[PDB]
Amino acid sequence: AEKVLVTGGAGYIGSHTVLELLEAGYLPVVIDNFHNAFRGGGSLPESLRRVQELTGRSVEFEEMDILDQGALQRLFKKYSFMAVIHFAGLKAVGESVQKPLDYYRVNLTGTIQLLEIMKAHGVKNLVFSSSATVYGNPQYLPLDEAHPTGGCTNPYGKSKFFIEEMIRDLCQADKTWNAVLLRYFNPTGAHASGCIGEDPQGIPNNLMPYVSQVAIGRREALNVFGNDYDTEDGTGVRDYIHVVDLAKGHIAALRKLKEQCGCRIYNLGTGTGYSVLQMVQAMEKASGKKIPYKVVARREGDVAACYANPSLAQEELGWTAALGLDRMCEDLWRWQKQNPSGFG
Amino acid sequence: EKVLVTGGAGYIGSHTVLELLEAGYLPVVIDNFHNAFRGGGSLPESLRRVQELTGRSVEFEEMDILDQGALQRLFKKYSFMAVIHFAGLKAVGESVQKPLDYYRVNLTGTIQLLEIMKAHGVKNLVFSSSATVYGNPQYLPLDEAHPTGGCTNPYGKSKFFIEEMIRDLCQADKTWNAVLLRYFNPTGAHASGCIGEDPQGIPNNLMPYVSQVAIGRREALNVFGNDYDTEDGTGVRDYIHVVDLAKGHIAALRKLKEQCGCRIYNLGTGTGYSVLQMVQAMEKASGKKIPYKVVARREGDVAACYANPSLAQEELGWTAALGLDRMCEDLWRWQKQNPSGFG
Ligand SMILES: NC(=O)c1ccc[n+]([C@@H]2O[C@H](COP(=O)([O-])OP(=O)(O)OC[C@H]3O[C@@H](n4cnc5c(N)ncnc54)[C@H](O)[C@@H]3O)[C@@H](O)[C@H]2O)c1
Ligand SMILES: NC(=O)c1ccc[n+]([C@@H]2O[C@H](COP(=O)([O-])OP(=O)(O)OC[C@H]3O[C@@H](n4cnc5c(N)ncnc54)[C@H](O)[C@@H]3O)[C@@H](O)[C@H]2O)c1
Ligand SMILES: O=C(CCNC(=O)Nc1cc(C2CCC2)on1)Nc1ccncc1
Ligand SMILES: O=C(CCNC(=O)Nc1cc(C2CCC2)on1)Nc1ccncc1
Numbered sequence: 040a041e042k043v044l045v046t047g048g049a050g051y052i053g054s055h056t057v058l059e060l061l062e063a064g065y066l067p068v069v070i071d072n073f074h075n076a077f078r079g080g081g082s083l084p085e086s087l088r089r090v091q092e093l094t095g096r097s098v099e100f101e102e103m104d105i106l107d108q109g110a111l112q113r114l115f116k117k118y119s120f121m122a123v124i125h126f127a128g129l130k131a132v133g134e135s136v137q138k139p140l141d142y143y144r145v146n147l148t149g150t151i152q153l154l155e156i157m158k159a160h161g162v163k164n165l166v167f168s169s170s171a172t173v174y175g176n177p178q179y180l181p182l183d184e185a186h187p188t189g190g191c192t193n194p195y196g197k198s199k200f201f202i203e204e205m206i207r208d209l210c211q212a213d214k215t216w217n218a219v220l221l222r223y224f225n226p227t228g229a230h231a232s233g234c235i236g237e238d239p240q241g242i243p244n245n246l247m248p249y250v251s252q253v254a255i256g257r258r259e260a261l262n263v264f265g266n267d268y269d270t271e272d273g274t275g276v277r278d279y280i281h282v283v284d285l286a287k288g289h290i291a292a293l294r295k296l297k298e299q300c301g302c303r304i305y306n307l308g309t310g311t312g313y314s315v316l317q318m319v320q321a322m323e324k325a326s327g328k329k330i331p332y333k334v335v336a337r338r339e340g341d342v343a344a345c346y347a348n349p350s351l352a353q354e355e356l357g358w359t360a361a362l363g364l365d366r367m368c369e370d371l372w373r374w375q376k377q378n379p380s381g382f383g
Numbered sequence: 384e385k386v387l388v389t390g391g392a393g394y395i396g397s398h399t400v401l402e403l404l405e406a407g408y409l410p411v412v413i414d415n416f417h418n419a420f421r422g423g424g425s426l427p428e429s430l431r432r433v434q435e436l437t438g439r440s441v442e443f444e445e446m447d448i449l450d451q452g453a454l455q456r457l458f459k460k461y462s463f464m465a466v467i468h469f470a471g472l473k474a475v476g477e478s479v480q481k482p483l484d485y486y487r488v489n490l491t492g493t494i495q496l497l498e499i500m501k502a503h504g505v506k507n508l509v510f511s512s513s514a515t516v517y518g519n520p521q522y523l524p525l526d527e528a529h530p531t532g533g534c535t536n537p538y539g540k541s542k543f544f545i546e547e548m549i550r551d552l553c554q555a556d557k558t559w560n561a562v563l564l565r566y567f568n569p570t571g572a573h574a575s576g577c578i579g580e581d582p583q584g585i586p587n588n589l590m591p592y593v594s595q596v597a598i599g600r601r602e603a604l605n606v607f608g609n610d611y612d613t614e615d616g617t618g619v620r621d622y623i624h625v626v627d628l629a630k631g632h633i634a635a636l637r638k639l640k641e642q643c644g645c646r647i648y649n650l651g652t653g654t655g656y657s658v659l660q661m662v663q664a665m666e667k668a669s670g671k672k673i674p675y676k677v678v679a680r681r682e683g684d685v686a687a688c689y690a691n692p693s694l695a696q697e698e699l700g701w702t703a704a705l706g707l708d709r710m711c712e713d714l715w716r717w718q719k720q721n722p723s724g725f726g
Contacts, residue, residue, distance in 0.1 A: 136551075136554070137555055138555065139548065139551040139552055139554075140494065140498050140501065140548075140552060143490075143494050143548050144494050144498065147490055147494065148490070148494055148495075151483065151486055151487050151490065151491055152491075154483055155483060155487060158483065189532055190532070194548075194551045197544075197548075197551070201490075201547075204544075205482065205483070205486045208482035208486075208537045209482055209483055211479075212479065212480060212481070212482050212483075
């Protein structure tokens with residue numbers, strides 16, 4: 040066994056991770072159902088067509104849904120996987136509140152079925168792409184891996200917590216499993232080529248893609264949800280990690296599995312949070328554009344500040360984020376300007 | 384319209400099917416026989432006997448809640464008003480050994496049920512939960528304000544995760560009505576003696592193990608600890624007569640018609656019983672001596688855990704009538720009439 044399955048590998052973090060896997064000398068097999076990825080003019084998703092050009096290496100790809108048991112069984116019989124990196128899922132928080140059953144079905148049932156097939160095929164090596172929203176509202180900052188988990192405020196976050204708990208119980212029951220749960224906040228930026236990046240369908244949910252679309256002329260003005268928080272400038276402080284650093288952390292996790300590590304949990308991040316206005320300022324600097332905004336009411340449930348402590352990963356995974364705020368913004372801008380409408 | 388009872392061939396479900404018929408509802412049961420006994424015809428033996436006890440028909444389909452196609456066809460074939468959901472895996476000790484089976488049956492089965500309910504406009508649910516979702520007690524008796532989610536095994540986690548999914552569904556869609564019923568250990572049996580709990584592989588409470596004793600199929604009960612902070616030093620736990628429990632599921636079903644949204648109620652007698660109290664009550668009911676041996680505690684067991692059922696009295700109009708002596712008398716009658724259960 041010598042392939043790495045990457046579920047959801049056509050998406051934002053997955054496509055960057057497939058690139059890093061290829062550059063690191065692994066042999067990926069990617070599956071995706073195109074729920075949130077654009078089709079290319081050939082078989083590959085456009086993101087992965089471009090990854091093949093960027094790396095000079097071929098991407099093995101199957102269009103399939105991880106909810107389809109028969110397809111998943113056939114996949115694991117056809118390929119000999121040594122590990123799985125699991126990105127396939129739904130991840131829009133506001134959508135999760137409106138459509139909880141879809142989130143529980145894709146995220147929970149999808150992951151359970153993946154685990155069941157992995158077990159059946161003796162593939163017991165997993166990197167799970169988790170979320171630091173599993174810590175709930177912060178009780179101390181920065182959040183480290185000892186901080187309590189649970190008490191999530193939306194179905195997305197609850198789904199990620201529930202999956203973590205299931206994996207932890209699986210590993211307790213069977214000490215031959217190795218699983219690395221990676222917790223992080225907001226992936227930002229893009230591969231330095233500007234050829235791939237986050238390609239939101241419709242009006243972006245999140246700050247940075249919205250700000251980039253204001254800068255390019257695609258959107259009127261940003262809404263800033265509250266400026267009366269207990270933060271330096273009154274706007275909320277959040278944690279942003281360059282997607283390339285994040286992708287490299289998934290490769291470091293894959294290496295940790297080879298140590299027969301059992302169940303391990305690591306935060307990934309830079310260790311420093313930024314306010315909404317700090318991100319807007321840095322995007323004006325990178326883009327050379329004004330980014331108008333208006334301050335509106337706080338959203339119910341939003342906390343003043345949340346950011347992660349990446350010290351454990353810096354020791355045990357050998358991983359450090361190299362790319363700071365200006366690089367995140369410069370790389371997002373380059374993707375945006377080179378691809379004003381995204382992939383399509 | 385009919386009432387679907389998932390897992391209705393099993394212990395609590397069969398008693399609830401009987402109470403549905405006694406209350407004037409039309410039951411349809413699904414079960415995969417994972418943990419129930421087949422009759423000599425098309426019905427589970429439990430349900431064949433329920434038909435005799437009531438004089439009424441039970442409709443039954445053998446199927447797995449994990450089979451989406453079977454569930455879709457079920458909801459097209461019958462017109463349901465509501466669902467009472469018992470189908471699941473429930474042995475706490477088994478869940479530690481085989482967690483993925485518990486998550487798959489309990490989580491994926493429930494999610495698929497909720498999605499098919501939604502797809503057919505059936506938005507009224509009674510979920511049979513577990514008071515283990517409270518975790519180790521921080522105060523007693525446990526009421527519905529007590530913290531939840533501190534669960535100590537995969538079974539309890541799965542029940543808590545289901546509750547959270549249902550709460551989020553009800554938040555997203557105010558037209559859903561769902562009653563989540565939390566309780567501890569069902570015991571006893573229908574007073575006919577004709578139905579009860581079949582022999583279990585991995586019991587959650589001491590009363591059958593005990594019932595295997597008084598009849599002579601075990602030597603002595605092991606008592607796990609006699610040094611707890613309890614009246615008599617043995618652990619105090621919460622036991623509800625299965626007939627009272629079943630009737631609480633009917634009260635929950637009626638509450639849905641009030642367009643109650645999401646509601647959560649504990650069911651129980653309101654008083655816990657120690658191990659020695661259970662042994663003494665069983666000796667009284669059976670007329671047999673029940674030897675025991677005190678052994679070390681099991682790691683992680685707490686001194687006492689029992690629920691406050693006051694809110695159910697106020698909002699469901701429900702109380703448990705049957706105390707410990709009646710639980711033991713009714714268990715003993717089932718055991719005497721059916722020493723190996725339905726088999
Ligand atoms: N983006 C974030 O802010 C963030 C933060 C923390 C964790 N995560 C996690 O990262 C993962 C990837 O996030 P992303 O930002 O790249 O999102 P994304 O939507 O770009 O990528 C997810 C990919 O999964 C695919 N997919 C969805 N459902 C699938 C299914 N049933 N079968 C097969 N493929 C399916 C999508 O088509 C998409 O290409 C998810 O697990 C998410 O929870 C993301
Ligand atoms: N017995 C307890 O200690 C206890 C305590 C609290 C809550 N509960 C809950 O009560 C319910 C019923 O408990 P019970 O004591 O009557 O147990 P039981 O095992 O007698 O009944 C459950 C029934 O579900 C069926 N079933 C299991 N998996 C199924 C599947 N995939 N598809 C269809 N049917 C399936 C079984 O065959 C069985 O007849 C469960 O939801 C459980 O979590 C039980
Ligand atoms: O602007 C938007 C979406 C992007 N806006 C965003 O993420 N802002 C934020 C984020 C936060 C965090 C909570 C405290 C810190 O605080 N402010 N959408 C929109 C704009 C204009 N018209 C309609 C829709
Ligand atoms: O007796 C048995 C099993 C039944 N015994 C039981 O549940 N007792 C208990 C339960 C509790 C609770 C924890 C504190 C309250 O406290 N004691 N098993 C056995 C006997 C002999 N040989 C092998 C196995």
